[PDB]
Design a protein around this nucleic acid. Structure first.
Ligand code: NA
Ligand code: NA
Ligand code: NA
Ligand code: NA
Length: 327
DNA sequence: CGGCCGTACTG
DNA sequence: CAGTACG
DNA sequence: GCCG
């Protein structure tokens, strides 16, 4: 953790976010990787060639780094559309993405007041706007613990054998957490079927859950619950809660997926692809058949992965503690 | 030229 | 399906 | 945007 180029990545992140909200996701992914490189790196970049030498940084990006050091600014930033700040504001409503934000902007909306009174909102967006400020805040990990304990307690209350674990940034050892990721499974391998009903209707008794964003409860094969909860007592804020229930055989891949980070998973899955293998939150497969565009055309076969170490091993990668998975 | 991860809900 | 979301 |  030593940002030796904050002054540059600072101006780049602004541009990356602008491209993201406008919907230019690949260009944004490009900047996102170059930005991290310039951070993870060990000294202030002082040359056009030091830069190029850095993975994730090409000529085009190096040139821009130059401008920041020689000129102190980036003329590219002085031509960003005036719509960006508004698109970013609209895009921060849970449930609304680049497409919805661009539409609202097109319709003449410029503020949350406009959205609240004139915009047509999906059930999810109404909930997101309702907790707009709350969904932008991170929580002390200590509170994440209380939330994971509240979920786990209600789960083991009707089946003491249930294994509950908090993943995400929590397991990666961060000081604060954006939301709480709770993974639930069962050692026997069957008793995890159709438990969402009991867990969710148990957490609703005690009034712990306040809003539901994603919860397909009419289906017995529900895999995830994305919602909102709030601990009891004064001074509590609404927090995002994400729960997944998986079969014990998929426990390791699930744990690995849910622990992240997101960029870490993508990188790992990208490696598996170069090796004709495939990785998901369900399993690690080998002998996968893909076409010219890297799209799966053949299923291949699932490899036994009892633990996270097995996944790294099978991929010919040295294991990495959760805390060492921020990218 | 063209992929850039592989999934799960919603309506 | 497109959109949005999860890590 | 980067990279193979
Ligand atoms: Na350009
Ligand atoms: Na959003
Ligand atoms: Na999280
Ligand atoms: Na539902």
């Amino acid at each position: 953790a030593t940002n030796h180029n904050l002054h540059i990545t600072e101006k780049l992140e602004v541009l990356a976010k602008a491209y993201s909200v406008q919907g230019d996701k690949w260009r944004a992914l490009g900047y996102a990787k170059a930005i991290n490189a310039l951070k993870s790196f060990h000294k202030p970049v002082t040359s056009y060639q030091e830069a190029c030498s850095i993975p994730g940084i090409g000529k085009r990006m190096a040139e821009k780094i130059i401008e920041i050091l020689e000129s102190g600014h980036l003329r590219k930033l002085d031509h960003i559309s005036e719509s960006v700040p508004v698109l970013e504001l609209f895009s921060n409503i849970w449930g609304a993405g680049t497409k919805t934000a661009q539409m609202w902007y097109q319709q003449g909306f410029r503020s949350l007041e406009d959205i609240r009174s004139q915009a047509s909102l999906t059930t999810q967006q109404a909930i997101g706007l309702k907790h707009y400020s709350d969904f932008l805040e991170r929580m002390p990990r200590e509170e994440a613990t209380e939330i994971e304990q509240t979920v786990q307690k209600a789960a083991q209350a009707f089946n003491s054998g249930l294994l509950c674990v908090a993943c995400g940034s929590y397991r990666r050892g961060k000081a604060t957490c954006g939301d709480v990721d709770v993974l639930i499974t069962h050692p026997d391998g069957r008793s995890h079927r159709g438990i969402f009903s009991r867990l969710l209707d148990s957490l609703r008794q005690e009034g712990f859950l306040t809003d539901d964003l994603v919860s397909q409860e009419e289906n017995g094969q529900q895999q995830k619950y994305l919602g909102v909860c709030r601990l009891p007592g004064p001074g509590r804020r609404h927090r995002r809660l994400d729960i997944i229930v998986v079969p014990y055989s998929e426990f390791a891949c699930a744990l690995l997926y849910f622990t992240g980070s997101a960029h870490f998973n993508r990188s790992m899955r990208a490696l598996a692809k170069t090796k004709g293998m495939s990785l998901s939150e369900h399993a690690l497969s080998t002998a996968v058949v893909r076409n010219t565009h890297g799209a799966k055309v053949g299923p291949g076969r699932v490899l036994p992965t009892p633990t996270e170490k097995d996944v790294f091993r099978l991929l010919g990668l040295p294991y990495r503690e959760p805390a060492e998975r921020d990218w």
